[PDB]
Structures are given as C-alpha cells and as structure tokens.
Amino acid sequence: PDVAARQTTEMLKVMLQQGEAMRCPQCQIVVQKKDGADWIRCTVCHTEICWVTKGPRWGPGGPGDTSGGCRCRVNGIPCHPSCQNCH
Amino acid sequence: TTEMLKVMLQQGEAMRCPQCQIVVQKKDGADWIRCTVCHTEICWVTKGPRWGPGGPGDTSGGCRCRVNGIPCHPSCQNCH
Amino acid sequence: MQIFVKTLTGKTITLEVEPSDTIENVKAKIQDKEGIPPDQQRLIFAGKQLEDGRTLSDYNIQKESTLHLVLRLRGG
Ligand SMILES: [Cl-]
Ligand SMILES: [Zn+2]
Ligand SMILES: [Zn+2]
Ligand SMILES: [Zn+2]
Ligand SMILES: [Zn+2]
Ligand SMILES: [Zn+2]
Ligand SMILES: [Zn+2]
C-alpha cells in the first residue's frame, strides 16, 4: 500500500543521509558502492561518479573535462581530504 | 530456412521490423539496422524503432538514445 | 501478475511475474528488459532488501505493488 511506499522512502532517505547511496548525477538512478576506491561508473549512463564528494567526477565533456565535477588535483588540490583515488 | 527463422524469432536472433513487420535478422556487432524493405532505422539493442514517425532525428518516439546524455540501453555502443 | 519497478527518478518499468517467482528470477527479468546484470541489482519493497532466495509471496508482494531498484556497483 502507501505504507510500503513510505517505508521505502524512509529507507532511501536514511541511506542517502548516511552516505551509503546517492543518485547518479546524470540519470538519477540510486547507486550504492560496494568496496574499492572513491569512484564508481554508472551502469546505466556510464557517468563517472566521485563517491567521496557524492557528485560527478567530470564536467559535461566526460573524462578529462575539469570545467565541472570534483576537479580532484587541479592545481594540485585533492577534491576531499579523505580521497585516496576518485579516478 | 523457413523453420530456422521461426526459431531465431523466439530466441531473439531476429525481430519484426517495427514499421513493416517483416522478419529482420540480427546484424552481429551492430546496435542499429536499416530495414532492407521499408528502410526504416531499427534500434537492435532495445528491439524497437530508432525514431518516431518523423524519421531520423524525431525523438517523439523511438529509443531516444543520448537524449539528456542517457544511452538507450546500458549495452548500447552506438545505435546511430 | 503485474508489478512495477522504480528505476530513474520518476520512471518505472512493468514486469510480468507470479506470486511464486523467486527474487533471483525477478532480477533476471529486469536484466532481459533493462540490461542490468543481476549481481548489480538490489531490490527494495516496504523498506527491506529482498533476499535472492525468497519469493514474492514471502514478502507479500501483490498485484500492482511497486519495488524500487538500486544499483550496487564496485568501486574502481
Ligand atoms: Cl564521466
Ligand atoms: Zn547514471
Ligand atoms: Zn573526486
Ligand atoms: Zn579525489
Ligand atoms: Zn521494415
Ligand atoms: Zn537505441
Ligand atoms: Zn543507443
């Protein structure tokens, strides 16, 4: 019913708040990371996601485009103090 | 063979053209086919019309690949 | 029986299942329609992850119910 729908909405809200899930910034499906480094590639749209900043790794030109995205290491500055490798 | 095509169609190695309904066989490797009879553009990876009734460019129907940067299917490499 | 799976924000897909289908079986129908490998799929209904071994019945998933699909992906 609507109870089942609200229980899922609450589960998703909690996952988002705890950093266990996010929405793909391009196609908006909910993604979780299982192991590995600070980045994932969305299976639906192939966008590279910076997990440690919970956002796109790159701008609209794709890999290599630092006009958007987390800009890790541009001018030598990591995108987040805990980043070990967001690609 | 007539009996072979019957099998390919159920196993997804062939489909019916979304415009003219004639049997179209898989083109290995390719995510797009042009129907040899009616010349309509077919998205093979989603098994449907590539475009709407306005023809190439008409995203009012079809698989809408790359609209808003979203591929039509996670496995699509290029359905034109 | 018809069920609905939420995918992208605001988008759903429809599936054709039976009360007795297993979760692994439903993830295989999602694969054939949407191209997502089963091991990348996590299904949520009524606030709980669904276990590959149960069936729709064990979770009281009935006609027109709505599941939410989540992608579980490996870090690089
Ligand atoms: Cl990207
Ligand atoms: Zn995506
Ligand atoms: Zn980053
Ligand atoms: Zn980084
Ligand atoms: Zn045709
Ligand atoms: Zn396509
Ligand atoms: Zn495509």
Residue B62 lies in a domain: yes
Asked if A23 and A5 count as a contact pair (C-beta separation under 8 A), the reply is: no
Method by which this entry was solved: X-ray
Which residues in chain C are contacts of B75 at CB distance < 8 A? 35
Q: Where are the beta strands (DSSP E) in chain B?
A: 14-16, 23-25, 32-34, 41-43, 48-49
What lies within 8 Å, CB to CB, of C26 at 6+ separation is C3, C15, C17, C43, C56, C67
Residue A84 lies in a domain: no
Asked if C38 and C71 count as a contact pair (C-beta separation under 8 A), the reply is: no
Which residues in chain B are contacts of C36 at CB distance < 8 A? 74
> What's the full length of chain A, in residues?
87
Helix, strand or coil for residue B34?
strand
Tokens of A13: 């809200």
Helix, strand or coil for residue C64?
coil
Residue B78 lies in a domain: no
3-state secondary structure C18-39: CCCCEHHHHHHHHHHHHCCCHH
- Which residues constitute the domain of residue A41? 2-76
Which residues in chain A are contacts of C5 at CB distance < 8 A? none
| CB within 8 Å: B71 and A46 | yes
What lies within 8 Å, CB to CB, of A7 at 6+ separation is C46, C47
Residues in the 5 Å CB sphere of ion ligand 4: A 72, 79, 83, 86
Name the CATH architecture for the domain at C2-71.
Roll (3.10)
Residue in C68, C69, C74 closest to A36 by CB: C74
Residue A82 lies in a domain: no
Total number of domains constituting chain B: 1
* Residue A58 near chain C (CB below 8 Å): no
| CB within 8 Å: B75 and C34 | no
Determine the distance separating the centroid of ligand 7 and the alpha carbon of B31, expressed in angstroms: 7
Resolution value in angstroms: 2.0
What lies within 8 Å, CB to CB, of B17 at 6+ separation is B23, B24, B35, B37, B38, B40, B42
| CA gap C22, C43 in Å, rounded | 12
